[PDB]
């Protein structure tokens, strides 16, 4: 209320004349009116504050209750592998509630603290102001004899808390108890040492580099007389593959901006994680490397292999770092996370996790990388020929096309392996928890890929032949796609994030409590997810307007860094909605 | 880890006797560790006790001058006077207070470190006797668990507010406000970013540079003027990124530059600042290069790159604003001024180190005079056509010796010097260093001249430059081998008559190895003797275009010395001066 103290003090010395500015009488008439309002704006300060001390008690004396149950529950929990991690939860959960009533106490603490020193400190401005000594009185009477203040009780229980729950869980583990319930906890990264950060901008720098000479020498030095399309074809999906990794790394620095726990929902290591530096200098490393070897390719010093090594070492030594045997180079989070492939492909064995349906979710918008692998494979095995110098193949020749075409249809195998396994995980799921609220309708979101995939590939196979009755499935499969397009969309933003929901309050078209800064923030990634889940739309604009051959190969790989946009953006509200439930 | 490789590491015998032997060696090594650890629990435990009676006597003390101070008030200057013996006393308790809690920390530290430790061997001898003893006796001690001094100076620091600041419960809590003590210097990380990304791009722009220079670069067209320009500006960065190695360096070694800098507690910079200005400078240096070969720009003459590049240097110094260490280049912008003078202002410590560092800057002097030399009566500003791009007599009669004007540029630092030497015998009346550095440095315009003559002289034809030449080489050695004895004797303060153990070296040191001393030595004699190299190549038939090639090559070496020489000159001035 010190505003509200400064603003009466400079309303009375403005109420206030001079000497013989004004009578007497109407000066002392102005004086009264003065001391009148003062005295209202005090007996309203008084009443607010009794009304904010009356709040405090009775919040404390509720988080006290709430800190009685916990601690009860968890030794009846106690006195009666899993359960290891699940008693190890709740003493995180208990140490975590008890650090939370700590602050919330030294929180009240300073705040009753600057409360008193703003009513002393307006008590003396209207003392020097207006002559009168009501206002020491009044903070004498409130400030110095603030039950708040006088009630110590709070820390010494708190304490006494604490001391129980290390005692009972810790077993006299005081250093992680400390840990646990220190004062800081964001906020400060904490900062690597240096060595790392230097590492990420040093190959930050040279991949930009690589890259301005890379796009220099495809402008200038190229020339357009043989098709280089192909490259792309085996390249794309690498890159694909490395900017992921870019985006993942601001990702995780986002749950460190909102303070969302994170690192539990995972189940990993909490004394043991990965901090977004070394995300980035494994993206900068694999970037570099992929510059290397495009340039390598791009320009071919030596007259002797022109092609056939470069991409080949360049994925050879990218899977043989994925599975490097050797305890250096992130050993652990490579055994984790190839342990994690193992358990989401070997499903019926273990119960299904966060981390598994969510890695399973990040393949299904990275099947452009099996794309490009079926491609690579399609391309060594059947119609190229080792034995040949450079590779300038007219295409005239009838050889082309051979595996350009869908030839035995493999190519809806290989775009729907996410599809299905997402299908599988949630039948599992609906076998194990019984409940078929939340699985049957998403077995038929997943499901309807299925009929998509089978439904393009059908038309592109028939289209050749004739059978002008063509028109009737294309336009099944147009309204296939809008169902589906719907279908994600509504689950979405319904389920995924919580939005829209029918309780929504003053935060329209949001949910109760939110986490992230800014709603700008919400409104712009809803925009942005509502026109890219139709980029293929667009797609079919051109084939309703263009006749010219093989238009769509370009802007499918204008498009394929999109669909990873779209789950960056999606990752972000997926935790914090996630945060609410469990799985 | 100590415990868990040192352990490791023993690899018993699984049969080499009976049970019973392998038994009695681990209960004697459980007895040995029990031993130690009740030592050390004994020894924090007297500690502990030190620290808590120290912190009772001064919480005694502290309440003895609160009652005394409360009993004087209870009963203009002496309003004044009671106020200043507050003050006086609530600094005294908040300095006793925060020793205390010092001392609580450490001693905490110490038990959650010596019980962690216990742990830890109780993990890897796969034993609980260890744990157990330290959770009965370790984690039960009281002295820990009581919190009751933080909640008594609480209280106590807000009967002062009350009682004597008449209600001032914010400034006596913030003048009391001492809990989670610790602070450091960390460098911002956002720094160690940028110094990588500029390092990155400075060494991949370098090897595109010798790419293009190998492969695309064609004879006809002239380099030697080019490379004349670029090697100042090489010189230049390399220079700041030696200046940041010598002063990380000193840092580490722990030699307080600052205090004999007389600079700001703040030191105007860090050797990450220096790293990123020189990478930026490089980063210039070479996007100017390839600028000027490769020309891919329209019709932009190539002649323009390195002035803007150059005009940025003194554009990054005479820069108006507020930005780019706003701190440093005005102080250097300022000790260059100072310098440059001489007679005019005091002499100091870092003009004396300024001088000494632009002695050996030699190139970076007279590079310029070559530029504004072709840039005067050399240029073709106007047009493009047959204006002579070629080379001739003519056009080079300047970057030979020919005027002074190349001597007195190659001899300006030595000129400061001497003249600041001169400064400090005239102000401090002290003869043996000043006059024997006088000497020392004219033996640098002796040779400056002789050089000059003999090389005036030659293009006339008088048959006595077939003589004095002779005379120039030995006039080389009577200066050189004087230099040496001075940078041992007095200027590193090495070769000790006095020398006691240590051979070779003084008493008392500061770097860890001596083989860094050795090397020191002996590099040093092989560059102060650089100069007989040029001489041996330049003494049969002159090979076409091959006269300047040396000096590129042995110009970085010559700062290299200046990289080892500043190591022990501010070790040797503040170990024995301070």
Redesign the interface.
């Given at each position: 209320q010190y505003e509200a103290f400064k603003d009466m003090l400079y309303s009375a010395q403005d109420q206030a004349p001079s000497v013989e500015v004004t009578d007497e009488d109407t000066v002392k008439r102005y004086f009264a009116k003065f001391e009148e309002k003062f005295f209202q704006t005090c007996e309203k300060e008084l009443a607010k504050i009794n009304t904010f001390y009356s709040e405090k008690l009775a919040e404390a004396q509720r988080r006290f209750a709430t800190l009685q149950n916990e601690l009860q529950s968890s030794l009846d929990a106690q006195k009666e592998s899993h359960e290891e991690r699940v008693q190890h939860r709740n003493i995180k959960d208990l140490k975590l509630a008890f650090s939370e009533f700590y602050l919330s106490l030294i929180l009240l603490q300073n705040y009753q603290?600057?409360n008193?020193?703003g009513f002393?400190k307006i008590?003396?401005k209207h003392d020097k102001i207006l002559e009168t000594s009501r206002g020491?009185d009044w903070?004498?009477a409130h400030?110095?004899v603030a039950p708040f203040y006088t009630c110590?009780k709070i820390?010494q229980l708190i304490?006494e808390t604490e001391?129980v729950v290390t005692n009972e869980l810790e077993?006299?583990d005081?250093?992680k108890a400390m840990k646990r319930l220190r004062?800081p906890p964001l906020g400060a990264?904490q900062?690597?040492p240096?060595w790392t950060?230097?590492?990420?901008?040093?190959?930050?720098?040279?991949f930009?580099?690589?890259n301005i000479?890379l796009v220099l020498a495809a402008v200038f030095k190229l020339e357009t007389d043989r098709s280089i399309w192909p490259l792309i074809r085996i390249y794309r999906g690498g890159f694909l593959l490395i900017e992921f990794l870019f985006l993942l790394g601001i990702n995780t620095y986002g749950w460190r901006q909102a303070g969302v726990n994170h690192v539990l929902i995972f189940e990993l290591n909490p004394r043991s994680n990965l901090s977004h530096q070394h995300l980035f200098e494994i993206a900068g490393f694999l970037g570099i490397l992929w510059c290397l070897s495009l340039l390598a390719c791009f320009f071919a010093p030596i007259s002797v292999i022109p092609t056939y090594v470069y991409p080949l070492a360049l994925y050879g030594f990218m899977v043989f770092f994925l599975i490097n045997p050797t305890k250096t180079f992130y050993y652990k989070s490579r055994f984790w996370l190839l342990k994690l492939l193992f358990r989401v492909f070997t499903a019926p064995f273990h119960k299904v996790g966060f981390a598994d349906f969510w890695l399973a979710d990040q393949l299904n918008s990275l099947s452009v990388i099996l794309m490009d692998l079926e491609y690579m494979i399609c391309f060594y095995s059947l119609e190229l020929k080792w034995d040949e110098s450079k590779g300038l193949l007219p295409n005239n020749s009838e050889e082309s096309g051979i595996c350009h075409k869908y030839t035995y249809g493999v190519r809806a195998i290989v775009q729907c392996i996410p599809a299905w396994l997402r299908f599988i995980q949630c039948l599992r799921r609906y076998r194990d928890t019984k409940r078929a609220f939340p699985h049957l309708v998403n077995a038929g979101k997943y499901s309807t890929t299925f009929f998509m995939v089978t439904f393009a590939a059908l038309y592109s196979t028939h289209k050749e032949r004739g059978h002008s009755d063509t028109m009737v499935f294309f336009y099944l499969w147009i309204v296939f796609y809008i169902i589906s397009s719907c279908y994600t969309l509504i689950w979405d933003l319904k389920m995924d994030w919580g939005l829209f929901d029918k309780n929504a309050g003053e935060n329209t078209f949001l949910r109760e409590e939110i986490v992230y800064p800014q709603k700008a923030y919400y409104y712009c990634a809803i925009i942005e997810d509502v026109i890219l889940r139709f980029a293929w739309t667009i797609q079919i604009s051109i084939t309703s307007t263009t006749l010219l051959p093989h238009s769509g190969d370009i802007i499918a790989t204008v498009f394929a860094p999109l669909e990873v946009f779209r789950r960056f953006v999606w990752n972000f509200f997926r935790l914090e909605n996630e945060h609410l439930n469990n799985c």
């Open positions: 603290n600057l008193f020193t002393r008590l003396k020491a903070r004498v400030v110095e110590k820390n304490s001391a077993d006299g005081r250093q004062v990264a900062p690597a240096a950060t230097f590492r990420v901008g040093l190959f930050c720098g040279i930009i580099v690589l000479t």
